[PDB]
Amino acid sequence: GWGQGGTHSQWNKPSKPKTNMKHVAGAAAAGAVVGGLGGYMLGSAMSRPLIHFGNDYEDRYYRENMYRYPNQVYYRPVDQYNNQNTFVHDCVNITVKQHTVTTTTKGENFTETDIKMMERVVEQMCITQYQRESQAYY
């Protein structure tokens, strides 16, 4: 007539996490867990992987049992070329340019005029602005 108390356990219990950031790449933030017996595991081999939050009871009576390589993980990869990549390209290859090429041969009595006005061409770009009861003036 024994007794085990109930378990109220948290692998991650953050209370009121107020966080301001920009980039979360390959990481964990704002009270987040990257995988329980998992996550970013490109090549894995797990024998008898068990997750049970409930109570566990075992009454085992093993007699003259021949266990030959139980839960064996024969991890023998050959020439494994696997790609599991995350690519994020934001505001990449942005060009604001004015280019002029001049190639004049034996030019006599000639006038060359190259005017490239560039005014108010881009006012805003990639403005990741979060507003809450706020004001922004540009």
Binding positions for ligand NAG, rule: CB under 6 A: 89, 92-93, 108-109
Q: How far apart are CA 75 and CA 106, in angstroms?
A: 75
92 versus 127: smaller Cβ distance to ligand NAG: 92
Token pair belonging to 65:
């049992």
Q: Which of residues 3-62 bind a second copy (CB under 8 A)?
A: 3-62
Whether 125 and 138 have beta carbons less than 8 Å apart is answered as: no
Residue 20 or 109 having the CB closest to ligand NAG: 109
Q: How far is 71 from 48, CA to CA, in rounded Å?
A: 6
36 binds, among a second copy, ligand NAG, none (CB under 5 to 8 A by kind): a second copy
Please give the size of the binding site for a second copy, defined by CB under 8 A.
Answer: 138
Residues 71-90 that bind a second copy (CB under 8 A): 71-90
Instruction: Name the nearest CA neighbour of 123 among 138, 104, 101.
Output: 138
Distance CA 133, CA 103 (A): 57
Question: Is residue 130 within 8 Å of residue 99, measured between CB atoms?
Answer: no
Give the span between the Cα atoms of 49 and 42, in whole angstroms. 17
User: Binders of a second copy among 93-112, rule CB under 8 A?
Assistant: 93-112
Q: What's the closest the beta carbon of residue 96 comes to a second copy, in angstroms?
A: 5
78 touches, from ligand NAG, a second copy, none (C-beta below 5 to 8 Å by class): a second copy
Instruction: Scan residues 52-71 and list those touching a second copy (CB under 8 A).
Output: 52-71
